[PDB]
Design a protein around this ligand. Sequence first.
Ligand SMILES: Nc1nc2c(ncn2[C@@H]2O[C@H](COP(=O)(O)OP(=O)(O)O)[C@@H](O)[C@H]2O)c(=O)[nH]1
Ligand SMILES: [Mg+2]
Lengths: 284, 178
Amino acid sequence: KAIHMGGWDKVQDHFRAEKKDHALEVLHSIIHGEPGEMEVNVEDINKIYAFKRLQHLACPAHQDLFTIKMDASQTQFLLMVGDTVISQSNIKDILNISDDAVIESMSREERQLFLQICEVIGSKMTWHPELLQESISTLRKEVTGNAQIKTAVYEMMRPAEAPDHPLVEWQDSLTADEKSMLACINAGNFEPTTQFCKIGYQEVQGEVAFSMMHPCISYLLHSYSPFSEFKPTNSGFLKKLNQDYNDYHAKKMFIDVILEKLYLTHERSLHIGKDGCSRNILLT
Amino acid sequence: KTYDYLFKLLLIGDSGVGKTCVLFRFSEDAFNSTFISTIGIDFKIRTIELDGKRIKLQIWDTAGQERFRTITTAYYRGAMGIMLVYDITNEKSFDNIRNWIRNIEEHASADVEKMILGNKCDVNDKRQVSKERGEKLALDYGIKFMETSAKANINVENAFFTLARDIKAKMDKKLEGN
Ligand SMILES: Nc1nc2c(ncn2[C@@H]2O[C@H](COP(=O)(O)OP(=O)(O)O)[C@@H](O)[C@H]2O)c(=O)[nH]1
Ligand SMILES: [Mg+2]
């Protein structure tokens, strides 16, 4: 919550309290050692958190007119105040991926979550550039650790599972054929403690239905990199996530059978661990 | 084995034509009385038996929630079968079927099985769409059609069994190599 960029610790003293938010905005405009540092590609993703900063200064009556709509191509987010498009952003530039990378379509719920995750990423990179300069991991643990993001991700994927849900110990009930069938959801491998980090489940009237996290959501939370250099590696992670995604849905009539048996034998959860360790959480 | 395969199905149609009643008739053999209003009943299941294999039909009822041809590829992802429903009480809902169909061919997989249901066969006093008009639109697109009534429990069971049998058929031939 403490902002140190641009020496703001000692510069805020020259501003009345009523005006330090305006001044912080101009300060960000001013400040955002070339030899040795990596270029970034964050213009399009920062637009989204910047839109909410614009909406926040509107009156509560008019704030409902600030919406972000996907265009007909399903390749850009349109930033709209009423009927006016004030700016657009390419989704491939938001994700910092190559142009021939494939963006699987999202449900409207997933698009909302996508933009919320972008909003947190943008705010952390805008008001706290020190996270990224330390590490890409320090930036990422600040967004996956964010309370609203964790809550919203679990609400969508595992609504009846608390984010702090305790590990359930692994019980190997599967045949070899079943393990091969499940290998497609974790990049061609079967590892009990990681197989299910992308699998969600919800019960309607006591009946469980399974689903897989959208690849762009998976990518944004765990694999996103703002550096222009990482654009090929970013696209490599996304393509692998898409492959697991399309494999699951093609074989869903077989896989959900196996998932249900594991779900029922592990106390209605796939948060499965072995000897006290698990990576089957959605995000931490 | 508890069950062998999971067939995800979608109930598609305008609001008011009886999608939720059709679903609760097929899954729980129920109509009205002890009312349970779908505050979040996104799907119901019914496990049937075909050729010695037990199929869990997972039938979704989320059309019209926010889906007024706002739909894209994501809504049909994973679906193996689609039940299109109109109301023979309501010609407006029958003409809208042409829209739902083109939304499906342009956004859903090509090997998704589809069937048309003209629900409320039991209300002949208020009928607005002939049965022959129902079979003509279905003959146009080459998909099967039947008239149904969730209230009288007419043709609900054999409609879903036909759709599931069609899904199992092309799934089974796909598993001969591929
Ligand atoms: N007479 C008769 N009424 C029906 C039938 N199916 C539904 N209804 C009634 O039409 C109204 C809307 O039904 P509903 O299932 O909620 O439509 P939905 O919006 O497509 O889910 C309800 O009052 C039903 O009881 C039917 O087959 N015959
Ligand atoms: Mg309904």
